[PDB]
Motif scaffolding. Structure first.
Motif, PDB file in Angstrom:
ATOM      1  N   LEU A 130      -2.159   3.613   6.367  1.00 17.98           N
ATOM      2  CA  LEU A 130      -2.438   3.863   8.237  1.00 17.98           C
ATOM      3  C   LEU A 130      -3.589   4.749   8.604  1.00 17.98           C
ATOM      4  CD1 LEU A 130      -0.339   4.152  11.333  1.00 17.98           C
ATOM      5  CD2 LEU A 130       0.066   6.263  10.647  1.00 17.98           C
ATOM      6  N   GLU A 131      -3.832   5.336   7.823  1.00 18.51           N
ATOM      7  CA  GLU A 131      -5.537   6.317   7.537  1.00 18.51           C
ATOM      8  C   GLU A 131      -6.943   5.089   7.442  1.00 18.51           C
ATOM      9  OE1 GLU A 131      -4.731   8.474   4.157  1.00 18.51           O
ATOM     10  OE2 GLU A 131      -3.905  10.465   5.637  1.00 18.51           O
ATOM     11  N   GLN A 132      -6.239   3.601   6.879  1.00 15.23           N
ATOM     12  CA  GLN A 132      -7.157   2.784   6.880  1.00 15.23           C
ATOM     13  C   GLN A 132      -7.072   2.073   7.938  1.00 15.23           C
ATOM     14  OE1 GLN A 132      -9.332   2.647   4.166  1.00 15.23           O
ATOM     15  NE2 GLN A 132     -10.294   1.369   5.516  1.00 15.23           N
ATOM     16  N   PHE A 133      -5.404   1.585   8.430  1.00 15.94           N
ATOM     17  CA  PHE A 133      -6.086   0.977   9.658  1.00 15.94           C
ATOM     18  C   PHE A 133      -6.861   1.678  10.881  1.00 15.94           C
ATOM     19  CE2 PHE A 133      -3.048  -0.430  13.929  1.00 15.94           C
ATOM     20  CZ  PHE A 133      -3.847  -1.388  13.775  1.00 15.94           C
ATOM     21  N   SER A 134      -6.118   2.871  11.013  1.00 20.09           N
ATOM     22  CA  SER A 134      -6.866   3.572  11.804  1.00 20.09           C
ATOM     23  C   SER A 134      -8.434   3.808  11.844  1.00 20.09           C
ATOM     24  CB  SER A 134      -6.554   4.259  11.981  1.00 20.09           C
ATOM     25  OG  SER A 134      -4.946   5.241  12.368  1.00 20.09           O
ATOM     26  N   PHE A 135      -8.829   3.719  10.728  1.00 23.30           N
ATOM     27  CA  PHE A 135     -10.577   3.697  10.893  1.00 23.30           C
ATOM     28  C   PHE A 135     -11.580   2.414  10.807  1.00 23.30           C
ATOM     29  CE2 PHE A 135     -14.144   2.405   7.965  1.00 23.30           C
ATOM     30  CZ  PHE A 135     -15.260   3.694   7.156  1.00 23.30           C
ATOM     31  N   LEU A 142      10.347   2.014   6.191  1.00 21.85           N
ATOM     32  CA  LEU A 142       9.238   0.596   7.100  1.00 21.85           C
ATOM     33  C   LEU A 142       8.067   1.250   8.224  1.00 21.85           C
ATOM     34  CD1 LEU A 142      13.513   0.350   7.775  1.00 21.85           C
ATOM     35  CD2 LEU A 142      11.503  -1.536   6.945  1.00 21.85           C
ATOM     36  N   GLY A 143       7.993   1.956   8.154  1.00 22.89           N
ATOM     37  CA  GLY A 143       7.021   2.406   8.968  1.00 22.89           C
ATOM     38  C   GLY A 143       6.415   4.034   9.114  1.00 22.89           C
ATOM     39  N   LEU A 144       5.552   4.165   9.749  1.00 25.39           N
ATOM     40  CA  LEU A 144       4.758   4.834   9.831  1.00 25.39           C
ATOM     41  C   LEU A 144       3.429   5.040  11.371  1.00 25.39           C
ATOM     42  CD1 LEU A 144       4.507   7.831   8.199  1.00 25.39           C
ATOM     43  CD2 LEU A 144       2.151   7.146   7.837  1.00 25.39           C
ATOM     44  N   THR A 161       4.399  -0.889  12.047  1.00 26.53           N
ATOM     45  CA  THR A 161       5.396  -1.238  11.589  1.00 26.53           C
ATOM     46  C   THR A 161       5.668  -2.703  10.240  1.00 26.53           C
ATOM     47  OG1 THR A 161       6.870  -0.734  13.892  1.00 26.53           O
ATOM     48  CG2 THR A 161       7.591  -3.242  11.875  1.00 26.53           C
ATOM     49  N   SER A 162       6.321  -2.845   9.321  1.00 28.25           N
ATOM     50  CA  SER A 162       6.789  -3.503   8.254  1.00 28.25           C
ATOM     51  C   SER A 162       7.913  -3.947   8.124  1.00 28.25           C
ATOM     52  CB  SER A 162       6.349  -2.900   6.569  1.00 28.25           C
ATOM     53  OG  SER A 162       6.811  -4.197   5.565  1.00 28.25           O
ATOM     54  N   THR A 163       7.924  -5.572   8.273  1.00 28.83           N
ATOM     55  CA  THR A 163       9.524  -6.149   8.814  1.00 28.83           C
ATOM     56  C   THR A 163      10.328  -6.666   7.302  1.00 28.83           C
ATOM     57  OG1 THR A 163       7.977  -8.572   9.788  1.00 28.83           O
ATOM     58  CG2 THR A 163       9.382  -6.535  10.825  1.00 28.83           C
ATOM     59  N   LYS A 164       9.297  -6.607   6.566  1.00 27.36           N
ATOM     60  CA  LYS A 164       9.666  -6.401   4.719  1.00 27.36           C
ATOM     61  C   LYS A 164       9.967  -5.246   4.458  1.00 27.36           C
ATOM     62  CE  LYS A 164       8.667  -8.646   0.787  1.00 27.36           C
ATOM     63  NZ  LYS A 164       7.616  -8.773  -0.564  1.00 27.36           N
ATOM     64  N   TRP A 188       0.575  -1.322  -0.118  1.00 30.70           N
ATOM     65  CA  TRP A 188      -0.321   0.157   0.156  1.00 30.70           C
ATOM     66  C   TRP A 188       0.560   1.195   0.233  1.00 30.70           C
ATOM     67  CZ3 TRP A 188      -5.449   1.766   2.102  1.00 30.70           C
ATOM     68  CH2 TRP A 188      -5.809   0.080   2.135  1.00 30.70           C
ATOM     69  N   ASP A 189       0.193   2.385  -0.017  1.00 32.74           N
ATOM     70  CA  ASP A 189       0.989   3.501  -0.090  1.00 32.74           C
ATOM     71  C   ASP A 189       0.701   4.054   1.167  1.00 32.74           C
ATOM     72  OD1 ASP A 189       1.850   6.407  -0.662  1.00 32.74           O
ATOM     73  OD2 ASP A 189      -0.099   6.976   1.124  1.00 32.74           O
ATOM     74  N   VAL A 190       1.956   3.844   2.056  1.00 29.76           N
ATOM     75  CA  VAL A 190       2.379   3.735   3.266  1.00 29.76           C
ATOM     76  C   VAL A 190       1.215   5.127   4.600  1.00 29.76           C
ATOM     77  CG1 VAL A 190       3.985   5.424   4.077  1.00 29.76           C
ATOM     78  CG2 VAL A 190       3.693   3.943   5.805  1.00 29.76           C
TER      79      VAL A 190
END
Ligand code: INN
Ligand code: ZN
Length: 253
Positions: free
Chosen positions: A101-106, A131-133, A164-167, A95-97
């Protein structure tokens, strides 16, 4: 410090990508990885003296691990942080990072309202080495749910989130690298901004211990300062903790 309000309890979420690639399709492997990572991250926080004196013992603990074993089924035009496809470009591994983060929060809004922080763990190759946001320490959000009415979402979302992404670059990052990503993202949640080059005390040279965890460019945990917060981060986070511990921190388990 208030020992009854010194811990930021976390909702940790492992998406299907994390479950498959990091968990090797096993719940025990998925949870053990996360429990160990958060505990090493907690050591950095707990041992940090925010005022360089006795204001220490503040940390993080997992309240719950949500394990998403399979992708989230979605209707046409509908998106979800755990769906099979990447957004906005399905042809990409990630995804676009910022959109993720916005989608996860929603999607996590109801659960996020009940915890100090919610953190997403994924396995996707974000463009250009990201790697993260996280929300907080931006030039609002961070620790303790703060509502934001989403005009697009048509509902309240909470800004107490990060990921966090581990890839990265087609491979699993080292555990010593993953620890640093999560420490940095939670650092933003705790109120720290990126360490600037213009302040030598907060961004030392390699022969002077190297960069601190809030540096904008990823550090491999081999230099002396890499697993620590700078004086810049400590000043920002000290102010956050003072204002926020009474609001949503709990007693250490
Ligand atoms: C753990 C790091 C410090 C988090 C930051 C993003 C950030 O500030 N999140 O809050 C990052 O992903 N930085 C990448 C970074 O440094 N990634 C390294 C591993 C990398 O891929 N470097 C190659 C440079 N082309 C950037 C976006 C600066 C390329
Ligand atoms: Zn950052």
């Amino acid at each position: 410090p208030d020992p009854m309000k010194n811990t930021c309890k976390l909702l940790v979420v492992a998406d299907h990508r994390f479950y498959r690639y990091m968990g090797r399709g096993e719940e025990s492997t998925t949870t053990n990885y996360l429990i160990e990572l958060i505990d090493r991250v907690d050591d950095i926080y707990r041992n940090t003296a925010w005022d360089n004196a006795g204001f220490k013992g503040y940390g993080i603990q997992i309240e719950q691990i949500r394990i998403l074993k399979s992708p989230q089924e979605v209707k046409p035009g509908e998106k979800h942080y755990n769906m099979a496809k990447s957004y906005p470009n399905e042809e990409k591994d990630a995804w676009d990072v910022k959109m993720l983060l916005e989608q996860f929060s929603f999607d996590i809004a109801e659960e996020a309202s009940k915890v100090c922080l919610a953190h997403l763990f994924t396995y996707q190759d974000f463009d250009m080495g990201t790697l993260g946001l996280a929300y907080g320490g931006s030039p609002h959000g961070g620790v303790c749910p703060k509502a934001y009415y989403s005009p697009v979402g048509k509902k309240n979302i909470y800004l107490n989130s990060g990921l966090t992404s581990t890839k990265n670059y087609g491979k699993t990052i080292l555990t010593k690298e993953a620890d640093l990503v999560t420490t940095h993202e939670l650092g933003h949640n705790f109120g720290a901004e990126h360490d600037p080059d213009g302040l030598a005390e907060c961004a030392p040279n390699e022969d002077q211990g190297g960069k601190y965890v809030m540096y904008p460019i990823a550090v491999s945990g081999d230099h002396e300062n890499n697993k620590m917060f700078s004086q810049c981060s400590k000043q920002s986070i000290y102010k956050t903790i003072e204002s926020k511990a009474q609001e949503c921190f709990q007693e250490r388990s």
